[PDB]
Amino acid sequence: SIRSLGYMGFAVSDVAAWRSFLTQKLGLMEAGTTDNGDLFRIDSRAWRIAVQQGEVDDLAFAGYEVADAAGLAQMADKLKQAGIAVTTGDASLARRRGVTGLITFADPFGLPLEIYYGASEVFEKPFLPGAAVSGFLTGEQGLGHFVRCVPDSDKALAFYTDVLGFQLSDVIDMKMGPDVTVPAYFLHCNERHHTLAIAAFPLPKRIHHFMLEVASLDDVGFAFDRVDADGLITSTLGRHTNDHMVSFYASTPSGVEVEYGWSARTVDRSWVVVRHDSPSMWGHKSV
Amino acid sequence: SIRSLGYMGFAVSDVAAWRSFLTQKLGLMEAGTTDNGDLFRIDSRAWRIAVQQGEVDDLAFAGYEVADAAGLAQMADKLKQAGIAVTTGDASLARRRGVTGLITFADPFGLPLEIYYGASEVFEKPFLPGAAVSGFLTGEQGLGHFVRCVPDSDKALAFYTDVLGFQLSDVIDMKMGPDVTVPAYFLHCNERHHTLAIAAFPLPKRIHHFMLEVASLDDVGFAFDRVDADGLITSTLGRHTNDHMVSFYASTPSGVEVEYGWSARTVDRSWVVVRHDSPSMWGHKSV
Amino acid sequence: SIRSLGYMGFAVSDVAAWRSFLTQKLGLMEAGTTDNGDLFRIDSRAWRIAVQQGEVDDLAFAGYEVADAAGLAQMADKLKQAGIAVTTGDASLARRRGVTGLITFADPFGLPLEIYYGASEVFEKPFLPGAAVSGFLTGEQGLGHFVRCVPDSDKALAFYTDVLGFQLSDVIDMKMGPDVTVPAYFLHCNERHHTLAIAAFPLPKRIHHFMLEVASLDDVGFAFDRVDADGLITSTLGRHTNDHMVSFYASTPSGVEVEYGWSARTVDRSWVVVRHDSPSMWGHKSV
Amino acid sequence: SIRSLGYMGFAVSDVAAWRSFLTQKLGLMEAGTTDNGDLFRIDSRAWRIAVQQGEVDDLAFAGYEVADAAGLAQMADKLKQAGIAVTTGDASLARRRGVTGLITFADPFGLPLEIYYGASEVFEKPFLPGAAVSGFLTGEQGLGHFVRCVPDSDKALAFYTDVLGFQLSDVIDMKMGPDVTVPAYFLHCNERHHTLAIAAFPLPKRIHHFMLEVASLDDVGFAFDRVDADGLITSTLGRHTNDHMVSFYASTPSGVEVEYGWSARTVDRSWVVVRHDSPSMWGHKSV
Amino acid sequence: SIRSLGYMGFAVSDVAAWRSFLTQKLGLMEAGTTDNGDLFRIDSRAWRIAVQQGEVDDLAFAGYEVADAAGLAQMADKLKQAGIAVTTGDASLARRRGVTGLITFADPFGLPLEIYYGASEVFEKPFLPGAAVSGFLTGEQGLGHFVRCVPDSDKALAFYTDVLGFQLSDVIDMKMGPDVTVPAYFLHCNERHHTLAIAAFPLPKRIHHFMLEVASLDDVGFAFDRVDADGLITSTLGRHTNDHMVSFYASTPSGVEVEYGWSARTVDRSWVVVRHDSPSMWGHKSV
Amino acid sequence: SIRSLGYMGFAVSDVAAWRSFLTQKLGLMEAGTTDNGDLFRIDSRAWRIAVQQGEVDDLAFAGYEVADAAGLAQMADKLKQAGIAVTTGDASLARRRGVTGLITFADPFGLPLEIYYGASEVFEKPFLPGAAVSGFLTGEQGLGHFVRCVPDSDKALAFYTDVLGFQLSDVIDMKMGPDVTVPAYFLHCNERHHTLAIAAFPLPKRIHHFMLEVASLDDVGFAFDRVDADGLITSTLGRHTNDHMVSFYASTPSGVEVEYGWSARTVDRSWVVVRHDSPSMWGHKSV
Amino acid sequence: SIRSLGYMGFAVSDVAAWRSFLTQKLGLMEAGTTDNGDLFRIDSRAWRIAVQQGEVDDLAFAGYEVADAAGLAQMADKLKQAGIAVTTGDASLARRRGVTGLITFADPFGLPLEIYYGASEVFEKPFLPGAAVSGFLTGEQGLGHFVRCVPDSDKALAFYTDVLGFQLSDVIDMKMGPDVTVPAYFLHCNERHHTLAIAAFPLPKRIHHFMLEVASLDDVGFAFDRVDADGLITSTLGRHTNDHMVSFYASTPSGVEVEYGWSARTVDRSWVVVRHDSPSMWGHKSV
Ligand SMILES: [Fe+3]
Ligand SMILES: [Fe+3]
Ligand SMILES: [Fe+3]
Ligand SMILES: [Fe+3]
Ligand SMILES: [Fe+3]
Ligand SMILES: [Fe+3]
Ligand SMILES: [Fe+3]
Ligand SMILES: [Fe+3]
Ligand SMILES: [Fe+3]
């Protein structure tokens, strides 16, 4: 069973711009360059985000974490019984990712996904942010979340819930005009309100945004000014209706957006699915 | 499995009187008028109480909430296997209620019931009470509770526990005279002491009372004076023996009573069924 | 300096009625009969209330407590410098009261007052209430409070604040009719909102009421029913605007009223004098 | 499944002595006399201990509480499948005990036992102790515990654990002389360290002692002096090695001993069975 | 101003008996032998109790601690202005006591007293008790307390309060027979209820007892059994009425008694002097 | 199911050196000598470590604790179904160990192991350390842990996880030179990060080290100096990367090392297996 | 009145070595270079440590902080009345230091001192350490402390306590050989155990060491390894006897030592002066 989103890899046209953006604007820690690409940290793990040179300028792969080898076996079996082509990652790939074991496959629309266990910790190299950030929230909630854009939401939903095991948190009916309303589905695999969201948005990218959560309001406020100085803000500070995250959105060098937030609520055992007609309580003014 | 009482609808002869009573006396928030009727809020949900014009001057329907679509499927199946006529609510009905999916049916004595999932939240329209009330207690405990009057308690008990899944909290042997003692059964489906009570009381209404729970003693004290000013109090402040609710009772424009309370105790895992010979520890003097 | 109200003595026409009222209705503990009269306890002190046979059917004397012999000396000196006739209580009187040292005198309108130190504790005879009461609130807040009726409030104010050292908490402008408004002054000598209140009310008694504070709402609720059973309630449950005490009032066998309350707020160092136009926030309906 | 020890009944030769001992020495509340005998309370339940006139001067019956009717059915079935003669208590018996339903049977050595559900609460008649006692500890831990003397411990163990479902907490090897060592087995059915203990002690009674637990050390200290005044102490204050109860033992009018304690530790999920060679850490000097 | 009782010295006929009693029964730590005598510790200080060979078999001297050199100067001045013969301790004496500076003098009845500042700490030699004791309570409350027997209490009171600055906590009227009642005065110089008590008891020793306070009830319970094994208990476990200390008394090899207690209450700013007619709430049965 | 490591026995050439090392350096409590050997305590259990005269100068046996007799039966069955030679410990062996029941067998490489239930508690003989130690951490976490050296880690892993039920916490890839990297596997059977670790280290002993955990940093700091005084430190203070234990290592008289630590983190339900490339975050400099 | 040590300035021969040492080893934040020198931060203040090129390779000046202009006036007056040459810092100096007002003078042995008020905060430039450090402890405790070496301790004591107002915390008698014992005096001006210590040590520098306090043990552990890598450790980890600081000492490029610690205890109102014979409880082994 998937425990959380563990890592993400981006294939971008401008690696230097990405390096500067991640460290100086967002405050991630530069963790070296390997055959896995330029590595970035936000906690004790050896890396959480990898940046590789590539033409797509988008999310290249995402890795979901299971607790152990048994968990990996379960998932591989579940994917096979569903008719999904699964490849047992070879030692070389496992080494490049710094994991113990992994399997690779793709979602129904071509996004390369990896399920792994036994990632590397580096407590001996204490995390030091690239900018003043009190801390990032990971732990049992994993890396954060991202919104996957798809041409068919029902097909995507069936795969992510029936095959991968994600559970529905809630739905937001996004009014994208008078004649268009698109439901966005938010899914969880742990306490974090959502680790994955699915929506049929007509975007030129695989994901609408990825999100990183910080420890204090000031972390968000200071980062906003750093990003705003370069004219990269896409949405002012606001609070979402479903996860209650206080955040702003900004544009990365690839056009893909990043959400930088604080104070999201978690999903508990008494949680019930609900629907919303608005994505934000206040703020989040498009700029 | 039913998680809580989610909403209630009343069919009344005087809609204006009801509007004024709910907002000015009890402090509910007016939420607009739709084809679902005049809507009222007590929390983040789009509505909890609907008031429609009707001749019965009584509870018209009650909606029980399940966590998701799977839960809805389970219940529909459970009702069918029991020989109950269930109707899958059509899109039009689902839209009128503001829910994702629902099924309709009736209890053994004709009360229309609905089981649904995916109700609408409106965090973007923050709750503002119609009178000074610090807050209402809902959350995982749902809307509150109501006492269903029935001609046959054993038949009612079998349906609500065996088919709907409610669990018995306790029983109060109501001495309604020298020659008459009527047992009132209190049932729970979550932490709230009781979401439903059943009793063979000879009343001209479907329910003896419905209850709303507030956050502080002052909320109750202030409301008492507001209601008392119009001579609508039916029972002075007191505390019940079973749920330990401190409350007063008042008459709504339909004759049906409302209980407005505070500080009820909850049901835990070590709870055991007990019996009582009195409904109140102190107070609750009939007026 | 006066630390609190320590004890009170009543001279009544019906001692048996008083005994029954104090123990069975209010829950005080019967502490024996001495030359000091029938004694009653509410805590570790040997007695707090004394009931003696007398014709006035009213408060006979009140004792204010100082911390020690130095404190007693200070007060005696303060009274003398003000021209008040002070009598050093003789050993016989000290023994009757169970105190170490005391001085006696009267307020400007004839109420016998005593200031003492070194009262008797009886921890070896644990307090057991005469009725189900979880506990009374005394400690550093003393016995409770009483409202002294006077013909001239300014003369009374000068004596109690300038000579006895009480400090003003607040004032309530009591509208006793279209042509009459009487200010009630509330004074403190410790954390308790008021230990003494002064008002020019046209009553046939020395005090309007005396108050006892209990530990829980249920103590008040149960006592209300006990008193109500005998038709002795004079004012329904309510909460005062100034001390925020939730209480009811009842008639003692002498006609003097008793207030039985819970949850009063205390006076702190940042307290500021304010005025009110109403004595109650809610409730306290005269009956 | 048994949730706790709910009530006990004693058949004694001197009912008046028992009444005085329970109320004045131990502080129980006299709850009236019915066809069930003289009733005594220690909490919200209508009664916990019944005293009836009888020749045995010993424990006459004990009632174990289950959560509901389903629980009662389970136990009846379990006893039947074990070949135990079970009698469904008739309405008359249920009424005498003040319970909803019950079954009666006996342990392998003749002690009448009852398993019931739905006992009566009397919150409207607040508990008032017969002596100064801050409170008794019951709740989910039930009444307390008793040590059953038996001629064959293994036969007794098989019945109480295999049939009744009690779980072993620990064992104390009681050295009753050079040539005699008797193991005492302590069993639990809830958090209370033990609700029942079994030992092959050569006593003329069915039980060695029954125990009541109070809320504070002073409750124990004051009670000790009350009992000691009549020369009824059998064991000085001490603390047990297994349940860590601080207690003293005294003789009841029937010769059966009562343990009055405070501060016992509870059994949790990580509990493991252990053995002891001494019953007390300190104190408990036989007198 | 005196901050606390810092150390005590005993002059005894049997030093070995004292060594064994203090370490094995009471659990003090043996700290070596110097020209100051056999030294014993209960905390971080180099020593708190000194045992020297002597004929009196009694308290030889007591040392009161001031905060600093200024405090020492104040006290010396206060004693001189009172006509008391004060001697500035010489370097040799200061070295023997392990203090920075000290003055010596005697109370009105010949007890040698010392006031000092700058005692020695030995954090580098962590405290290890001679018997199983979780810890002793010292800190700002100092060593503990002792009751000084005197032929004239008023003369003793004047010296200790007017000259030494101790403040009265309370008084206990000790009935030592039909024709004799002796008041015991309890005095404090910090939070500890009393550091010194004065009473005109006809004892052959300078003090009735000295007290040591431990951290848990078990410390007291275990020590009781250790002492009881040698038949040295003089008073069973009990709780005092004034300081609320739960303790037992035992005889030291010199006949002087020691009180070993736990859970005493402290004196605060709102403390008021009171009187008691009994020294104990419960227990403390003379043996 | 195994609940924890309960006891360990060492067979050494110099029993006196071991006695002195354990009590004076580490602070264990000497618990007597029996046919089980010299016994040592760290908590309420009768013994945790046994030292016997022997030629191996190494760990002689280790005992794993199960909750009860059922647990013992389960394990015996599990071992038998795996083809392991199990011997039901005879009464004589059970008596020597002070346990209720036990089974004996060996791990794949000859280490004698015992699984037992019902060990002996000695609350009546309160723990008193041999040196100043505030306390040892045991409870549900058991004795501590040890690292088992093996010639084949996969064979060892299969036995300890598949047969004994231990679960993997994490792995550390120990670089023991340019051409050698050895994975160390850390396993848990309760909250303690690891109760057992397995590694193919080329050591002349059965275990690399055993660990004892204390309650405070000072316990570790003081012990370090005691051990350092004799030149027995093998590794300076440091903190491990996986269990986060702050500790130092020292050499026992047998050459086997002991780790003395504080502040280790525990394993929870959301734990996931990870890998590390370093065994320490800081410190732990080999000396 | 002096509130704390606010800033320090060093005049060194190798500014680059100092820059690298402070940021990379200790983790201070580089704050730019001004006419005040290379500036370093540890909190919200614009700078706490200044490094200037100079020949002394020692502490060049220290600044003590007062609360306001009135405080500055008081101190200037106090110094003048003592005959100390005080210079009112000119606007140019105030600007260079970034303060509102300041006075300059020297201690009896030539150390330039400054007393100022109104230093500059830079909350808009959030603190980011030069190495992984969770945080430094400053606030009301100021920068930290330093030990001033002097030829005459009594002369130094008189100036710092009588003129500057520092209060004595404690004294440590430093045995610097058989024939030499030197008392070190520790003084406080706020909660920090000591802000200044004075000792007649024969060192070639003005101060023995300066200390910086961090927020966690790991901060100390990681820094130790960073410093140890360059062979700069002078004293291993240990805990002091007086302030209870857990720290290590290292050599700065100027030879002056720096103490880097954690978990020091504070001085309260009930503090009393004591003496010690050892500077450390454990550790602090000279290397
Ligand atoms: Fe879920
Ligand atoms: Fe998002
Ligand atoms: Fe339930
Ligand atoms: Fe209700
Ligand atoms: Fe005031
Ligand atoms: Fe009042
Ligand atoms: Fe259990
Ligand atoms: Fe017992
Ligand atoms: Fe005082």
Ligand SMILES: [Fe+3]
């Ligand atoms: Fe005492």
Ligand SMILES: [Fe+3]
């Ligand atoms: Fe696990």
Ligand SMILES: [Fe+3]
């Ligand atoms: Fe280890």
Ligand SMILES: [Fe+3]
């Ligand atoms: Fe100070």
Ligand SMILES: [Fe+3]
């Ligand atoms: Fe220092």
